[PDB]
Design a binder for this molecule. Structure first.
Ligand SMILES: [Zn+2]
Lengths: 72, 123
């Protein structure tokens, strides 16, 4: 008593969700039974994220996640 | 040589936790190998993906990393510290990972004899 429930909460301002495929390293790696390491995506030439941290490959560009470097 | 290999992970994962040298996870654990400074990896044979083991055994072998064979992957979550303790010393919350990668060793020799004699015998 001494209130009304008022049912006036509207939080419908949807945020994102982190869609990760199951072990996205399989999206990153592809190895044949002889033992070849085929990195299917580009490697960023930055000093902080060189030789281990892989880029993105979009429909028209390359793209980093650490320093967000971009190509064509 | 006074201690077994299946329990050899225990004290070295304890003495390397004080230097933050345990790569809990799979992706960031494998990317530690691409930093070319990690020293050992552990595969749990209780696995869930046939694609998962054939990439990591291809990565660790060609870059000269040996292997410690422990069976269960929910069991490995204890010694990495990925499991929450209870009030008297039990893992009340079990969260186990299937890939453990060490980067830098602890400052001891109780594990640094047995892991070496396990290393030199398979050469
Ligand atoms: Zn980086």
């Amino acid at each position: 008593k001494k209130r009304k429930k008022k049912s006036c909460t509207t939080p419908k301002k949807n945020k994102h969700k982190r869609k990760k495929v199951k072990l996205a390293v399989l999206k990153y790696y592809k190895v044949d039974e002889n033992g070849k390491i085929s990195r299917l995506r580009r490697e960023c030439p930055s000093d902080e994220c060189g030789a281990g941290v892989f880029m993105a490959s979009h429909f028209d560009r390359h793209y980093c996640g650490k320093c967000c470097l971009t190509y064509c | 040589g006074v201690m077994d290999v299946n329990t050899a992970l225990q004290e070295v994962l304890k003495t390397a936790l004080i230097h933050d040298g345990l790569a809990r996870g799979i992706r960031e654990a494998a990317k530690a190998l691409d930093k070319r400074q990690a020293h050992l990896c552990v595969l749990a044979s209780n696995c869930d993906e046939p694609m998962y083991v054939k990439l990591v055994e291809a990565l660790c072998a060609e870059h000269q990393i040996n292997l410690i064979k422990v069976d269960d992957n929910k069991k490995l979550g204890e010694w990495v510290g990925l499991c929450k303790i209870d009030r008297e010393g039990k893992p009340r919350k079990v969260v186990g990972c299937s890939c453990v990668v060490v980067k830098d060793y602890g400052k001891e020799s109780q594990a640094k004899d047995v892991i070496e004699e396990y290393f030199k015998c398979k050469k």
